[PDB]
Amino acid sequence: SKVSLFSHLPQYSRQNSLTQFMSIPSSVIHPAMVRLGLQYSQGLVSGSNARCIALLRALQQVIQDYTTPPNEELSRDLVNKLKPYMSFLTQCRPLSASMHNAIKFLNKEITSVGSSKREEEAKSELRAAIDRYVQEKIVLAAQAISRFAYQKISNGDVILVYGCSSLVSRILQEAWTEGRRFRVVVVDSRPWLEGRHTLRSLVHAGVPASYLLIPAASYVLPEVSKVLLGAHALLANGSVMSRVGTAQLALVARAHNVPVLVCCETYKFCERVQTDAFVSNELDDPDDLQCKRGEHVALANWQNHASLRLLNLVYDVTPPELVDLVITELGMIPCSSVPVVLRV
Amino acid sequence: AKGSELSERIESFVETLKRGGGPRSSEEMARETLGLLRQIITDHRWSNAGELMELIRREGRRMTAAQPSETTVGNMVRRVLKIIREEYGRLHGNEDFSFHYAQLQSNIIEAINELLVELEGTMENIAAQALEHIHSNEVIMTIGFSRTVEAFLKEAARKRKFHVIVAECAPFCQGHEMAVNLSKAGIETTVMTDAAIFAVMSRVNKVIIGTKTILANGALRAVTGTHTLALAAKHHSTPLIVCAPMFKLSPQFPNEEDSFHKFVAPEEVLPFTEGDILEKVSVHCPVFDYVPPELITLFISNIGGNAPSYIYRLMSELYHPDDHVL
Amino acid sequence: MDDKELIEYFKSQMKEDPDMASAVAAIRTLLEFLKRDKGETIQGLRANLTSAIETLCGVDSSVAVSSGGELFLRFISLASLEYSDYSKCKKIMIERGELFLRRISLSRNKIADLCHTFIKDGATILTHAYSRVVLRVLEAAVAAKKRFSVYVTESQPDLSGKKMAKALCHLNVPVTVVLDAAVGYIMEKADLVIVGAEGVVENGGIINKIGTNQMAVCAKAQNKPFYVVAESFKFVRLFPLNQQDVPDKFKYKAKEEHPWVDYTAPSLITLLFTDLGVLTPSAVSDELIKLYL
Numbered sequence: 002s003k004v005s006l007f008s009h010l011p012q013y014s015r016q017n018s019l020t021q022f023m024s025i026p027s028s029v030i031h032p033a034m035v036r037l038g039l040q041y042s043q044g045l046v047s048g049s050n051a052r053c054i055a056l057l058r059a060l061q062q063v064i065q066d067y068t069t070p071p072n073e074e075l076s077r078d079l080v081n082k083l084k085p086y087m088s089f090l091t092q093c094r095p096l097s098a099s100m101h102n103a104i105k106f107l108n109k110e111i112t113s114v115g116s117s118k119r120e121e122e123a124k125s126e127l128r129a130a131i132d133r134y135v136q137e138k139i140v141l142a143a144q145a146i147s148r149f150a151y152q153k154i155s156n157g158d159v160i161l162v163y164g165c166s167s168l169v170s171r172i173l174q175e176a177w178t179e180g181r182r183f184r185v186v187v188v189d190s191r192p193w194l195e196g197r198h199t200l201r202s203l204v205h206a207g208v209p210a211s212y213l214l215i216p217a218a219s220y221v222l223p224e225v226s227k228v229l230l231g232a233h234a235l236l237a238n239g240s241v242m243s244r245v246g247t248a249q250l251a252l253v254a255r256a257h258n259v260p261v262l263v264c265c266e267t268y269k270f271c272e273r274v275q276t277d278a279f280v281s282n283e284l285d286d287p288d289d290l291q292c293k294r295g296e297h298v299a300l301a302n303w304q305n306h307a308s309l310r311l312l313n314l315v316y317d318v319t320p321p322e323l324v325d326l327v328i329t330e331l332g333m334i335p336c337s338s339v340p341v342v343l344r345v
Numbered sequence: 346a347k348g349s350e351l352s353e354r355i356e357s358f359v360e361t362l363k364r365g366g367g368p369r370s371s372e373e374m375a376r377e378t379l380g381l382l383r384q385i386i387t388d389h390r391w392s393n394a395g396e397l398m399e400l401i402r403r404e405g406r407r408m409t410a411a412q413p414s415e416t417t418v419g420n421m422v423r424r425v426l427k428i429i430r431e432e433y434g435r436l437h438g439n440e441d442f443s444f445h446y447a448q449l450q451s452n453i454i455e456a457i458n459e460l461l462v463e464l465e466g467t468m469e470n471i472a473a474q475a476l477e478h479i480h481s482n483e484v485i486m487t488i489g490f491s492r493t494v495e496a497f498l499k500e501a502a503r504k505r506k507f508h509v510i511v512a513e514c515a516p517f518c519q520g521h522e523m524a525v526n527l528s529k530a531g532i533e534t535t536v537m538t539d540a541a542i543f544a545v546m547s548r549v550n551k552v553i554i555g556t557k558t559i560l561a562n563g564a565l566r567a568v569t570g571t572h573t574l575a576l577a578a579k580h581h582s583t584p585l586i587v588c589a590p591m592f593k594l595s596p597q598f599p600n601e602e603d604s605f606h607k608f609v610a611p612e613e614v615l616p617f618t619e620g621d622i623l624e625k626v627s628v629h630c631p632v633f634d635y636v637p638p639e640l641i642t643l644f645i646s647n648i649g650g651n652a653p654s655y656i657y658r659l660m661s662e663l664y665h666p667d668d669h670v671l
Numbered sequence: 672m673d674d675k676e677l678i679e680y681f682k683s684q685m686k687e688d689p690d691m692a693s694a695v696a697a698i699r700t701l702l703e704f705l706k707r708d709k710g711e712t713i714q715g716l717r718a719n720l721t722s723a724i725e726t727l728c729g730v731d732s733s734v735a736v737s738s739g740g741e742l743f744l745r746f747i748s749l750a751s752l753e754y755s756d757y758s759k760c761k762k763i764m765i766e767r768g769e770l771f772l773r774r775i776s777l778s779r780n781k782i783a784d785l786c787h788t789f790i791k792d793g794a795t796i797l798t799h800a801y802s803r804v805v806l807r808v809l810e811a812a813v814a815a816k817k818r819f820s821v822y823v824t825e826s827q828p829d830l831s832g833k834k835m836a837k838a839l840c841h842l843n844v845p846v847t848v849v850l851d852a853a854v855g856y857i858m859e860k861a862d863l864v865i866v867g868a869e870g871v872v873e874n875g876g877i878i879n880k881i882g883t884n885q886m887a888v889c890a891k892a893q894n895k896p897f898y899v900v901a902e903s904f905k906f907v908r909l910f911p912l913n914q915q916d917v918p919d920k921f922k923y924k925a926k927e928e929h930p931w932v933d934y935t936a937p938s939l940i941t942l943l944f945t946d947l948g949v950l951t952p953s954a955v956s957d958e959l960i961k962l963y964l
Contacts, residue, residue, distance in 0.1 A: 238643065238652045260912050274650040276584045276643060280480070321652075325912065326874075333910055335874050335937075337654045338956040562942075562951050598942075598949060600789050654953040666948070 003284070004310050012284045015042060019093065030089055034059050038093040048166055049097040049233060049269075054135065056090075056100055060107065061131055069120050079111055095283050098234045098271045106134065142266045142330040147172050150264065150328050151179065158183045159226050164244055165195040166231035168264050174206050184209040186225065188218060190246050192289045215246055222257040232265040237274050239321035239339045245314050248278060251323040262326045263336075270343050278318040287311035347388040354381065355404070362412045370492060371417055375464060375592050378421040383457050386450070394433050394442035394449070401426060406671045413604045414633075416558045416595050419671065423596070423664045428456050430665060467590050468496055470647040475501035478586070483550045486510040489568050490519045491555030493588045498553075499530055508533040510549070514570055515539055516613050516630060539570055546577045552585045559594045561660060563638030563653035566605075569631060575640040584642045591647060596660055596669050599635065607632040672707050674726050681727065690803070693731055694739040694904055695775065700727065701743055702768050711757050720744060732925050734870035734878060734932075738907045745964060746771055778902050778946040779804055783811040786900065786944045794819045794862045800826040800880045801835040802867030804900050813842060821846045822857060826880065828929065851882065855889045864890050868901035873910045873959060875937030875952030877901070878917070881930060887939040896941045903946050906959050 003012050020039060027035050037059050045051055063086075070078055087104065090096070110130055114123055146168065154160070154176050162169055162185060173185065185203055187210060189196035196212070203210045213221065228250065234242040241247075241263060254261055275281060290311050291300050303309055324336040334342060358381060361367070385404065391397045405422035432452050437444060471493060479485070479501045487494055487509070498509065509532055513520035524534045537545065552574070558566040565571070565587070578585050599605070611628035638653050651659075677700060684696045704723050710716050724740040747767050751760045782804060790796070790812050796819055798805060812819070821844060826832040832848060839846040849857050864886070870878045877883075877899060890897055911917055911934055922930040937952040947958060 237650065272649075274477075274643070276478075326910065333873070334956055335953075337652065337953055340652065340655055341658050341957055342960075561949075602791075654951070657951065657954050658957070 002310060004312055007284060010282060010284050015286050030086060031063050033062050034086060038090050041094045049099040050167060053099045053103055057103060057131060057135060061128060064124060064127055074116050075123060076112055076114055080108060099269055102268055138268050143168060143171060145330045146264060146328055147175050149333060151176055154181055156182050159224055161186045161225045161228050162199060163188050163230060163250060165198045168231055169229060170199060170202050177206060177208055186211045186221060188213060188215055190215040218250060219253055222253060225259055228254050228259055228261045230263050232263055235265060235270045235339060237272055237340055239336050240275060241319045242316055245317045248317050248319045251319050255323050260325045263324055264328050267329050267343060275318050283315045285313040285315060287313055351384060351388060359408060359411045374417050375421055378418050379461055382425050393445060402671055409671060414607050417592055420592055420595055423668050426668045427665050429453060467647050471588060471645060472496045472500040474645060479505060479507060481505050483507045484548060485551050485553060486549050487553055488512045488570060488574060489514050490523045494553055494555055495526060497588055502530060502532050510535045512537055512539060512542060514568055542574055543577050546581055549583060552578050552583060554587055556587055556589050559589060561596055561598055563641060563656050564599055565636035567634055567636055569634050572634050572636055575636055579640050586643050586645060587641060588645050596664050677723060678730060693733055694735045697727055697736050697739055698743055698772060732920060734907055734921060735905050739904045742904055779807050781946050782900055782944055783807045785949060787811040790817060790819060792817055795860055797822045797861040797864050799824050799866050799883060799886060801831040805865060805867055806838060823848050825851055827851050854886050858889050858893055861895060863896050865898045868899055868905060870905050870907050871901055871955060872907060873956060875955045877935050878932050881933050883935055884933050887935050891939050897939060898942055899940060900944045906962055
């Protein structure tokens with residue numbers, strides 16, 4: 002019962018378990034990745050950072066237990082074997098651009114391996130390459146980004162944040178530890194309510210904070226001085242893809258004359274082009290929209306009514322005209338200069 | 346023999362350029378220019394690179410001064426010059442071009458052949474991206490006649506359904522042929538005059554247009570009437586898309602004006618049979634129009650989609666800064 | 672040589688020739704300091720040069736001086752680590768510095784040649800404060816048989832505009848002077864705006880004499896082009912966001928304090944005329960990275 006506008010996009014529920022239809026001693030799919038796919042439908046989702054780490058760990062474990070075919074080499078056998086695996090993982094839940102880049106890099110590494118070395122040597126080399134990739138592309142980039150962004154915070158500021166993101170929390174905690182004084186405002190939105198993680202982390206750190214909901218955003222903007230945001234992907238034309246609601250904040254901040262800053266790493270650069278905040282998104286379970294009113298819970302048995310649809314988007318796109326600065330591990334650049342610099 | 350034939354071909358080309366033109370597409374123009382340049386390379390005497398560069402520069406200046414409006418010829422000339430420079434720099438390993446080698450001609454000919462082969466397969470690459478921008482039950486508006494837009498819409502029409510609105514340009518009504526050709530393929534079409542562009546914008550989803558030339562800073566040289574269309578589209582924040590290949594990019598800035606437009610006889614507007622009234626009335630009939638780059642959203646080329654700010658970088662990898670002015 | 676000799680040489684070089692910017696004097700002073708050394712280790716020379724640049728910066732507080740010093744420091748040493756004898760390295764760097772000084776002095780003619788073709792025939796041109804490169808541009812334009820009219824601003828508090836007006840009158844050009852509070856009133860008759868620059872920032876904006884921001888906004892309200900003329904050695908690494916992000920060592924000269932400079936955003940600028948070519952504000956981000964080798 003999807004909306005005709007979003008007919009193409011598939012809709013899934015959280016109670017259609019796929020594990021019932023195969024043997025308990027799994028042989029079709031490696032058991033560790035079966036556990037990972039099962040966990041994908043419960044949690045372990047945070048800005049494509051934890052998901053990529055878990056996927057790489059599972060891939061390392063799978064590569065650990067491999068047997069060279071008598072009449073074949075590793076390069077073709079492993080590549081042909083891996084396809085049903087992440088095909089099933091995609092069947093569990095749609096992927097993200099970071100995972101696509103990671104699997105592309107892994108396939109490129111696999112293809113380049115020569116046949117001169119032994120199986121054990123190749124396995125050790127692949128593990129070392131994966132460890133180098135994860136160490137270089139995530140941790141050091143975060144440290145450099147925090148170091149760069151430390152210079153844009155001053156005493157007496159009021160910074161506004163949205164949603165849950167590890168990078169922003171790390172930056173704020175490091176800046177506070179360095180000996181600077183300020184206060185923070187947190188904005189949340191139904192139905193996930195992910196801002197409570199950030200609120201709890203900031204309270205435990207020892208930073209003054211305030212909390213409110215999205216529709217009152219125009220009430221508190223006269224006090225704010227900066228807006229700090231994360232991202233999920235970076236498109237070729239320079240747009241920013243994030244959780245639904247970011248574009249509203251950008252528009253109202255532009256209307257109130259407040260600068261906007263976006264933090265991201267350099268391994269999330271995608272090659273897709275989009276011109277509107279529509280079309281290419283992902284739908285979610287509509288039953289989460291049911292309000293727990295306590296008494297007379299409306300929308301109960303919403304399928305009974307003839308014409309009634311519930312919509313639940315996950316993503317939106319922000320044009321480059323509403324962003325004033327982008328901070329990556331290579332430095333600080335204007336938004337419209339993103340494709341020329343990073344393309345190389 | 347060879348010299349007489351080459352001179353005759355050059356004179357015929359210049360005369361055809363001077364006396365208006367004909368029903369020839371841009372691709373034919375580029376192919377003819379490349380063939381002429383290759384013929385000049387094959388059958389002329391030169392020892393070092395300096396003589397060849399000077400001869401090519403002189404011929405390019407002549408054929409460019411033949412007709413200012415046309416721009417693909419200068420682009421091809423500059424591209425050939427850059428190819429020659431690259432080949433000489435490779436073989437050699439302020440500068441001097443007096444050193445002699447015996448492999449330059451074959452390499453240059455092979456490079457020109459590769460360029461022609463690449464030029465042949467261009468329309469299909471642009472058409473292949475149609476399905477990512479057109480969806481079911483949408484209204485699209487275009488102006489004038491353009492082969493690239495025609496192929497772009499025809500490719501997408503095979504799987505989805507939509508409605509098209511065509512606005513005629515009426516110093517010489519050409520949207521009629523475009524509408525007829527679109528209707529023959531089985532697409533809903535509507536013909537409407539220039540006066541009602543603004544009143545219709547509230548029911549349009551996208552704008553797709555062609556162009557004549559692309560300037561360095563992303564500005565446009567389009568047919569007359571495109572400026573008002575762009576302004577109306579901007580008023581409603583409707584996206585705008587330009588379909589154009591790579592040989593329509595030139596390393597010039599909008600500073601000359603004057604000959605920027607192209608004026609024709611006022612016979613098209615006011616008939617000669619108006620009598621003495623045609624003795625104190627001034628009639629002006631421009632053809633081309635200038636469009637600033639703030640009104641363009643995307644560029645669809647034979648390699649992908651790029652923002653208008655990226656165009657500058659492309660130029661840096663296409664033409665040497667020395668050969669900007671012939 | 673000591674710091675007193677440095678300051679004396681700097682001031683004497685400035686006073687001897689009035690048609691010279693601060694950056695050229697600083698570069699010449701640094702070259703003279705290089706020629707009068709006696710050390711034996713490279714990084715000792717580096718420390719000496721850094722101390723000299725820091726001392727020189729304290730006398731005159733202008734944006735171009737620091738950028739010129741840094742560019743001179745990191746351009747002088749492309750290849751000076753090969754041999755084991757200090758003399759050869761010192762000679763090579765002296766030659767490189769002389770080449771850099773030679774290449775510096777040809778920028779104005781290139782800027783004028785590239786920019787003089789944008790002026791129409793019979794046009795009104797607005798300008799702010801005094802700048803030599805604008806005067807050179809106008810001289811090149813009038814040398815090509817063209818006619819135009821010029822409006823200028825008194826440019827408080829030093830009345831710098833009257834000096835440019837007097838210089839213009841020597842070339843028999845119609846020139847008029849207006850008040851500092853009548854810019855919006857007079858924007859109606861103008862056709863294009865050409866101003867100088869004191870420094871180019873990463874995002875494309877500029878830093879200039881106080882009063883440029885209001886003129887830029889007023890010109891934007893009525894859709895008039897805004898042109899900027901600048902030089903390569905005025906590129907600085909800074910990313911300000913608003914008017915209070917500018918470092919205080921440039922604002923006040925050594926509200927009621929009357930700050931001397933202000934910052935203009937890249938969204939109010941049409942084209943930039945530098946010795947590297949003609950660049951939109953979007954290409955400055957790449958060109959600055961490429962320049963800072």
